[PDB]
Amino acid sequence: MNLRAAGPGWLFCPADRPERFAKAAAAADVVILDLEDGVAEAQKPAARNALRDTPLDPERTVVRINAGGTADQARDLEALAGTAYTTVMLPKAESAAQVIELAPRDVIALVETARGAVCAAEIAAADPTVGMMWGAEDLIATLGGSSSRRADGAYRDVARHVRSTILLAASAFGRLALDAVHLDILDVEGLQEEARDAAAVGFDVTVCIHPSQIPVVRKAYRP
Amino acid sequence: MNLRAAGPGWLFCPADRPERFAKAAAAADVVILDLEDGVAEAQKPAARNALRDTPLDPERTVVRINAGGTADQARDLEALAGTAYTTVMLPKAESAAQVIELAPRDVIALVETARGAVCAAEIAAADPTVGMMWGAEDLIATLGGSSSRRADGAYRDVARHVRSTILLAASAFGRLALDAVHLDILDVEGLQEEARDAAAVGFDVTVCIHPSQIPVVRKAYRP
Amino acid sequence: MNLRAAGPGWLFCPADRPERFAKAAAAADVVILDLEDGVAEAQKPAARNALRDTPLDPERTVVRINAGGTADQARDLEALAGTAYTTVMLPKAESAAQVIELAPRDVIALVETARGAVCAAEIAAADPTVGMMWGAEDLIATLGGSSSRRADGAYRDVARHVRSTILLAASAFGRLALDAVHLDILDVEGLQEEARDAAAVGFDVTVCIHPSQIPVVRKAYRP
């Protein structure tokens, strides 16, 4: 695997919508096929079938599976066996052990809980790890909070603290660093500012949830 | 103990002023009877006697004892034996061991030194721990600094870093998270902003030093 | 050694320019003779000779050597043997072991990489350590970034996170804390603000790269 060779534009795409796969792969540098919150709890088995019969370039495609310890992740690995994918994205990554149990595939840990932020280095250190990502939304939620950004749009302090935390963790161990998804899709000004900053700080990628986000991300990382 | 069931409004009240106990308990969700810097070094033995003959609901009352390794903390535990209190707040909490030696009572660790911030997770992990709190004032002081806030009123960076640090530590281990006391009592605008933010970020409590602070705190955590 | 007794004004001075040594020592509280990036890769052997025949007060002088594991650091220690200097500054300090191998001399660790920030406490804990310093420029560079400050001049978040990280690390272990060099020499307003803040937060020193920077630093730490 050499996802570092790919551009900075990564895009999420629900695994239950195989019709969009082709467009997504063509629009992004890397496509993250989602089996998690991007697919209804009743559409998962469908998304798993589509993940099989509708193949995508394993060179530029990662599969986001479900959280460690769940039944859905178990079903995800079973469905992943019938594909040529080697890299998985683990949500709510909270320990090296959750990463290790995914060996021998490559794992991008998505830190989005307090325990994960606290064990960020341990997670980035694990052998299977090839990338570190963070998410503000589940972070604030699992914290018992209700807002990741303040009035002025800027992320709250805890989220900023974590962003810097996973950047250092990922870097300290030669892992790829992925910046958080800009949830307000129509807010391209905001995305541009975060992406520019992410480029300037060392992040290698900024994940997008909408194809319209890719060109702004690719431009912010231009130079 | 179930202090989580109590409201977000916690209030400090010097143990040498038993006359105010009743008013305090009635005004706050939880009352922190203080045996530390809230009582003159010569009024401590008095505060200890008042802690005995003037009982308060052990369900909504915690006792802040003195720092680990001191003679005063020793005298505090002895005086605490003659009461129905189970939860203590430990100032200058700098290690799991300082928490552990307070077993079998429940402990809320108050991180307010560099060593404590550095060992925040170790402290939150300890078995006796049921809550994590932070304080900017002793933090800057023990750091050799002289100001916790900058011109614009906002906390300096080191303090903000620590605030986020104890929030993640406390949360990662299912502990209660208490935000720092707003020292400028008449500045309700400032308190409102910090409390709102604390509510939004996951803090479960914002400690107050004055009864007039409680209603603003309770409102900020409204929704 | 008692560098804490010295003023807050520390100044870098290339070891290949022995003519300036005298002026530098007279202008600063402590002089950091540089054998690293402050001297051309071809002028190093010259700087090493000048470090020998042109002595400076070992009480107020530290020598910045080259990174652990390099040939240049090896040549630096050999040249350092013929001098009365006891304290060295280690760039790209990334572990306790890199510090330990410099025993028995005193070491000021300069954290300026992700691994170093991640192991900040381990480094500050090492026996040889007497000081902790940080640098934004190599930090962003080694991170794969390209800018340590944002449009408004303020340091980017990752750099601010690290600054606070080495302050707590150094303090938690009774080490001296040195704030980052203000690269824009003619920007005295900016330096004044950072130095004032550093004074207020607990930093004991603010390193300068130009003699004109010392008086502003000394004034910011006045009170």
Ligand SMILES: O=C([O-])CC(=O)C(=O)O
């Ligand atoms: O589902 C999404 O689109 C994004 C998501 O879960 C996350 O960032 O954690």
Ligand SMILES: O=C([O-])CC(=O)C(=O)O
């Ligand atoms: O004494 C007080 O009122 C508050 C205090 O010590 C602290 O926050 O650490």
Ligand SMILES: O=C([O-])CC(=O)C(=O)O
């Ligand atoms: O060379 C200089 O002048 C400053 C430097 O390397 C650093 O701060 O790391």
Ligand SMILES: [Mg+2]
């Ligand atoms: Mg998520």
Ligand SMILES: [Mg+2]
């Ligand atoms: Mg205190």
Ligand SMILES: [Mg+2]
């Ligand atoms: Mg450098």
